[PDB]
Amino acid sequence: LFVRNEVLPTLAKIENEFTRQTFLQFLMDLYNIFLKIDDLFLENKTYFSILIYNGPMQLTNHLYDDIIYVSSVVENSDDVSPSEYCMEYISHLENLCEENKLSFLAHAYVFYKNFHLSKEHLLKSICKYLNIIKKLKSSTYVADVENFEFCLNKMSRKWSRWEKDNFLASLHNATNKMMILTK
């Protein structure tokens, strides 16, 4: 199956060598990137049926609820909105998807993947640092990534070698643009 034999090794190979106001913005940025992914799936309902019919993932809803919670323990909470950088990235995903649906899909995947892989350490240590009592809904593991990986395996069964090549190459680009959203 494509994920275990091709995607996960490729990601392994791709391994080489801040106030509360700011944290709320961080979550708003993440909410909007993930929301955009959900919108670009629905805007191509036919192409992405296996990820839709698989049924919605829970992460956007978790972040939504987590933004409401964190809003409650931030002064001037209604002032904060998505950052300049996030709105670039949202347009970039539109554009990516417009050009090549699998180029876009690689970027969605890596985003779900790298968030899963880093969320628990990040959100615990940020919420410690900023004295934010309640653990966030979006730090919980609810198989979003596993479900993503399940759908990749099924989609890859109807992909040309070329389409797989594009997807695996696109992981590099997505991995990099990931890091850049870490400040």
UniProtKB/Swiss-Prot annotation:
Glycosylation (residues): N44, N173
Keywords: Apicoplast, Glycoprotein, Heme, Iron, Metal-binding, Plastid, Signal
Protein name stated in the entry: Divergent heme oxygenase-like protein
UniProt source species: Plasmodium falciparum (isolate 3D7)
Subcellular location as annotated: Plastid, Apicoplast
Changes seen on gene knockout: Conditional knockdown results in severe growth defects and widespread parasite death in the third intraerythrocytic growth cycle. Impaired apicoplast development.
GO-annotated molecular function: heme oxygenase (decyclizing) activity
Whole sequence portion shown: 95 to 298 of 305
Role this protein plays: Essential for blood-stage parasite viability. Required for apicoplast biogenesis. Associates with the apicoplast genome and mediates apicoplast gene expression. Can bind heme. Can bind protoporphyrin IX.
